[PDB]
């Protein structure tokens, strides 16, 4: 089986878990104790040299960066499970919205999740000033999404693709925060969020969040 | 021909130009006047709804995000020009180092380029403190690169790939700044920078910069 080295409470690990479940790929989770700094020790730093989770080993291949592992699973196991790709030249528009997720959505979203979800469990107060200004940026991104999702059922096409999937971990995390209002207030975004978070493969990830 | 809507002074536009020249794809530049704010006007905001450059139109396909356009060009025109992919499972490691470029390198490299190259052009001041701090961050990234490039001639394989190519615009821009020392002091990184910036396709990009 594919071996996924990370943590169930890591959003970036969650991203890969989602793909693995969509693609029905056999795998085992190898736990990395983040509090203990294992992600900064050996062997984990031999699998991800930046000292981050997740990494993965599949046969003779070792991989890191969640979106790379995700895309690798979706290609390598394409014939199994959910079809996360598109026909013909549709792949190009999946690339576009994958890169929107990486470069437009994620910087703001991740920061919001750090400030509101992770920092509190470590006893650190949320930087509300940073949250406010970061929500401005994210609202502007989601206004673009609201327009897109008025024309297309999902971001890259009228079907669920990896472009949508890569959004799941931070969108889920934000639903548990006052940033949920950014999603609720945009009616196509809201329904799209309901659609992606309601998927069975994502429910399997959520099962793993105590 | 492919229409590339952007500016040669834009690093993200340069990233696409590099792939277009490597792949020997006929294209025409459609200049977008950033100083006049055309990237925030129609029709450009119908091509890139985030009001950024570049965007591209290839026949009936419209695309934005430089790395999406770039990877589209490399796949769609794979048989032409330089081979930017790898055989077998090698694609997976290309994805890894593409994502490293997007998530590990680009944030601090882009910030250094903004502070030292773009602000001076404008009427904004170079924040020396933030430059120092951000050089610490980039230096640590490039320490990982040095280790990688000690084992592999290029980042994803022993051959030039899109993972390398996507670094060109910000690396070139930093060579014209004192951040050049971060590359000069790391010998495998230095030779790799020499190897990629010395390519004919990159020279064709630089030829467009007055
Ligand atoms: N861009 C990477 C980021 C991975 C990442 O930041 N993971 C977090 C856990 S969610 C981590 O390991 N943080 C520890 C650190 O940065 O030192 C990916 O997508 O895999
Ligand atoms: N992630 C995007 C970034 C594009 C980008 O930021 N372009 C700059 C010029 S290099 C821009 O258009 N700036 C105007 C703005 O952000 O308002 C890409 O790779 O294409
Ligand atoms: Mg509607
Ligand atoms: Mg050596």
């Amino acid at each position: 089986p594919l071996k996924l080295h990370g943590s169930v409470l890591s959003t970036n690990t969650q991203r890969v878990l989602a793909t693995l479940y969509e693609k029905e790929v056999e795998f085992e989770l190898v736990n990395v104790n983040l509090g203990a700094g294992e992600h900064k020790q050996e062997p984990h730093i031999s699998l991800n040299p930046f000292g981050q989770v997740p990494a993965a080993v599949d046969g003779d291949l070792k991989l890191f960066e969640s979106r790379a592992i995700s895309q690798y699973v979706a290609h390598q196991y394409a014939s199994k499970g959910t079809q996360l790709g598109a026909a013909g030249n549709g792949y190009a528009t999946i690339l576009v919205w994958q890169e929107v997720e990486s470069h437009q959505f994620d910087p703001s979203a991740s920061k919001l999740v750090w400030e509101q979800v992770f920092k509190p469990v470590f006893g650190l107060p949320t930087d509300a000033a940073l949250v406010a200004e970061t929500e401005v940026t994210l609202g502007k991104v989601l206004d673009v999404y609201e327009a897109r999702l008025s024309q297309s059922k999902y971001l890259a096409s009228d079907s669920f693709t990896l472009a949508d999937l890569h959004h799941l971990p931070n969108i889920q995390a934000l639903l548990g925060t006052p940033s949920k209002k950014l999603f609720d207030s945009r009616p196509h975004v809201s329904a799209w969020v309901a659609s992606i978070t309601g998927r069975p493969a994502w429910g399997k990830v959520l099962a793993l969040l105590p």
Side-chain angles (χ1 to χ4, degrees), chain A residues 146 149-151 188:
Chain A
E146 177 68 11
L149 291 163
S150 301
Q151 298 297 338
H188 296 86

Side-chain angles (χ1 to χ4, degrees), chain A residues 11-209:
Chain A
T11 43
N12 296 290
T13 304
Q14 288 165 17
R15 187 171 301 106
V16 185
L17 286 167
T19 307
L20 286 162
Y21 286 129
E22 292 281 352
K23 298 300 305 174
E24 293 169 5
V25 165
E26 186 187 5
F27 74 96
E28 287 174 14
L29 185 68
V30 180
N31 209 2
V32 179
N33 190 331
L34 303 175
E38 284 172 6
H39 53 296
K40 301 306 197 185
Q41 304 170 336
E42 290 284 10
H44 188 73
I45 61 176
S46 289
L47 303 172
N48 186 337
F50 297 95
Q52 298 184 328
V53 295
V57 183
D58 197 16
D60 59 18
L61 215 56
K62 68 176 174 180
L63 304 173
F64 62 101
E65 284 290 330
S66 68
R67 296 166 184 80
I69 306 160
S70 177
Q71 281 170 99
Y72 159 79
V73 170
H75 285 112
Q76 198 72 5
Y77 298 97
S79 72
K80 300 166 54 50
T82 299
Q83 298 309 297
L84 298 174
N89 76 345
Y91 78 91
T93 302
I94 300 176
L95 287 170
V96 168
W97 289 93
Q98 285 178 173
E99 290 296 307
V100 173
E101 188 273 319
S102 277
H103 287 286
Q104 306 300 331
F105 177 86
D106 185 75
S108 289
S110 290
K111 193 168 185 70
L112 290 168
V113 169
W114 184 251
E115 290 297 333
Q116 295 180 106
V117 183
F118 289 110
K119 270 174 65 173
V121 319
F122 304 143
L124 298 162
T126 297
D127 186 335
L130 187 51
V131 166
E133 70 178 52
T134 300
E135 287 191 336
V136 170
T137 301
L138 190 57
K140 289 187 177 204
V141 173
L142 291 177
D143 291 336
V144 172
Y145 282 37
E146 177 68 11
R148 177 56 179 166
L149 291 163
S150 301
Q151 298 297 338
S152 182
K153 183 55 173 179
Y154 292 86
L155 286 176
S157 70
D158 282 329
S159 295
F160 182 82
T161 68
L162 223 52
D164 308 284
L165 187 149
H166 286 173
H167 287 83
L168 275 161
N170 283 331
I171 288 183
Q172 184 70 57
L174 292 174
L175 290 179
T177 76
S179 298
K180 175 177 179 283
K181 68 181 177 298
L182 298 185
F183 302 91
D184 292 345
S185 72
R186 294 169 171 81
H188 296 86
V189 163
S190 178
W192 166 77
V193 169
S195 293
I196 62 176
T197 63
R199 298 175 68 84
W202 187 241
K204 293 180 179 283
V205 184
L206 296 180
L208 304 181
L209 280 43

